[PDB]
A paper describes a structure:
Notably, sliding D2–I stalls on encountering single-stranded–double-stranded (ss–ds) DNA junctions, structures that are generated when replication forks stall at DNA lesions.
We determined a cryo-EM reconstruction of D2–I bound to this DNA at 3.6 Å resolution. The complex of D2–I with ss–dsDNA was also in a closed configuration, clamped on DNA. However, in contrast to the structure with fully dsDNA, the ds region of the ss–dsDNA is very well defined, with clearly visible major and minor grooves. We propose that this represents a stalled D2–I complex. Like the dsDNA, the ds region of the ss–dsDNA first makes direct contact with the basic C-arch of FANCI. Overall, our structure of stalled D2–I shows that FANCI binds to dsDNA through its C-arch, but the FANCD2 KR helix specifically recognizes the ss–dsDNA junction by means of direct interactions with the DNA.
Residue numbers in the entry:
A (entry chain A): 247 to 312, 349 to 394, 399 to 492
B (entry chain B): 957 to 1106, 1121 to 1167, 1169 to 1179, 1187 to 1226, 1241 to 1298
C (entry chain B): 384 to 396, 415 to 553
D (entry chain A): 1231 to 1398
Amino acid sequence: PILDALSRLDLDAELLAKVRQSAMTIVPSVKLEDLPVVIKFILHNVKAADAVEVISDLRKSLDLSSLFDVIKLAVRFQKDVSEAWIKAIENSTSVSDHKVLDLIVLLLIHSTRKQTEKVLRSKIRLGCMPEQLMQNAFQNHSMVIKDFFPSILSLAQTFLHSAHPAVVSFGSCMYKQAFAVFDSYCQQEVVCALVTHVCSGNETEL
Amino acid sequence: QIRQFQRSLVNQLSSAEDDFNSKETQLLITILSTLSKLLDPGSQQFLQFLTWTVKICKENALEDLSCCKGLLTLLFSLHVLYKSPVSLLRELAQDIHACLGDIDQDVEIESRSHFAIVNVKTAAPTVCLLVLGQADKVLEEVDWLIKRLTNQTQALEKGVILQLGTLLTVFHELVQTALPAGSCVDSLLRSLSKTYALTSLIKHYIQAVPGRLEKLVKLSGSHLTPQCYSFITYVQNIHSESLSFAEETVMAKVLRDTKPIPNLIFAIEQYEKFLIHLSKKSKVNLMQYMKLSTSRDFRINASMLD
Amino acid sequence: LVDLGFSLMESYEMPAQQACKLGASILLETFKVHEPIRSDILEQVLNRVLTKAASPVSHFIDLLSNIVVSAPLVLQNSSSRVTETFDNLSFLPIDTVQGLLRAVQPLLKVSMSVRDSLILVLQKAIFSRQLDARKAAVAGFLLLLRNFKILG
Amino acid sequence: FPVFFRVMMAQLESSVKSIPAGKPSDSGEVQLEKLLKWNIAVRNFHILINLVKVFDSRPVLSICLKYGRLFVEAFLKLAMPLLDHSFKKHRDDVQSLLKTLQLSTRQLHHMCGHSKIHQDLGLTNHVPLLKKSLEQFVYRVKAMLAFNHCQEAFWVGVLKNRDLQGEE
DNA sequence: GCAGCTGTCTAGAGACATCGAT
DNA sequence: CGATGTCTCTAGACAGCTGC
């Protein structure tokens, strides 16, 4: 309620800083149904240079636990923090081992793009992001499949056809994984994309 | 409306230097550059005004810098939608070379004066950066024309060869200028790297030979490359003199005044290399016009080491 | 045509300004003469304005104003889907809200439901103690008073 | 020979590049340890360039152009940062290394000129980058001299064009 | 007789080359 | 990818070269 009131109230820098470090200190300690309001506040109410590491603190807070779609909307409400998220995962994947939350939020920012795909290509050439984690993600968190978002992720294979063909195989694997869950209309759209692939282009994607 | 503003300028400009009130001159010059925008193309008043600012440029000798810069922009913002500005740029380059010294400081340029605005002071980066600014613009659209060139094709090649022939006469008379140190030297070296990238037109015509194109290379070989290398033999000593005035690290001022020189060398050879391809393919030897490439070495004077 | 325009506003962000002009022109033409797709065009432009504040987005409001002044009944035909847009008081209500209200003025006047939604959203916005929220509230107040006319 | 020449230049350039990069006088007793290496390296380079003079075969020139350019670029990128600081510690030996380098790389301009004279399409393709790199070396030497306040001790002069082991 | 006038030095601000990797 | 330093400059100042 204090953070909700401060959301309602105006902002002053000196107090905002100390209360926001206090918030970051007290985000993960509470139950998963309680911190989302805090995350929404720090998203649509707070914007600063230090957010580039505050969001990394949030990532560490949410690393363990990973219906709970309010966080997605909170990230939708503002876009500058999403660019900060891209900047943070530019180095978060450089040290941390590509946690599932990283690829989830990467899909979210790519949905809400050019910088995301540039980062994806760079880490394709860098560390290839072991895809068992995203297999588990599509196994458990398939409620946000909505093929229009991963469609660009798949068609990135075309730009990844110049070299490193293994990542094309990983993209094929993850489209195989995403097909066998639900969303029969999305399944037929995936089959339409696949027949497009066998029709246009050379024999490789065929 | 401009005529009453014209009367104010001619009276104000003709006034003595003690009554120049430069703030007035800048605004009135800019006020014409804004009002002259909406003069229609199909009017005679376009011409007598255009010939008036030319004749006011030929006669008046103004020593202010922003005044000269502002007035020239008007002339080049209007002689850009009526004709080819390269005729004006050549004349400006004719004056700059005449006004300043010579690249070889051995042969004396005739003391001509195509414009009275350019004096011993105004030939500074004040004008020499505007001329190279306009020259860059002309080269920029020529790239588009070369892009378009790559029954209407014959007409396109007529203008490009004619303009580049005039444009080469601009740089030939401008690279021979004894430019002062600073950014004006740096602009010329980079702009010379632009005009050579002459390569794309040669590269396109590999698909084909015409006599007009051969004359251009004849012009290019006899007007740009031998003169261009003379500039490099001069920029090495003007920067040595300019480098003595340090605290009177230095690494910034040694890897910044010399960086254009390697790039200019590369542009010359790349243009030179694509002539090899055309000379063999087009069964015509077009290299008797030009001369051999010249390089430079050094020897650290250990005698004067300390 | 409508897909081309949608991705035109997408690809905008001067040739970019010319692209905006061309996209606004084609969208207005395809809205004016095509009857059964004008609702789709309105839905597309309503879905495209949101989450767009970093780039100059005045094109959205201006072409929306043009298409509603050419055809104001489209929003009611779309069952007045502008009510959801009232949340824009937190993204960038410096000028977008003013222009949006300017555009939707006749449809707020004719339609009582959208007027009631506007008055309630502004009433809950005014006492929000945020500087941005209060700015949005006072901006909306600047327009709502003249939305209704009784002087003569 | 050309196979030997190709592999020898490639290995020499790779070994030269493998040397650790520039350092801002981080350690004593290393700025002279890491100079005899480049002394013997430029010795080997000069030897190979001399071996060019006896075999003017076209593949030999094609190998030499490219790999001399690559070795010069690697030298400029790596050894010269060491030279900046090492000039104060050691004065004549670095100068001798520079004399050897000028002795070797001076022939590469002659090879470029010979390639241009005969209009060899497949061999002139490497001339511009090598010439640019040689000019870059010429001026990076000025930069190094500036690192130790030696600006009247430099003199960039015109190089007389020569044929392969010949003249003009 | 130390009162007058005469100018390079310094801070303003705006445009460019490479500035240094995203 | 583009924040940054470098540079033509226009003026102002108080301080050296006129003076006094």
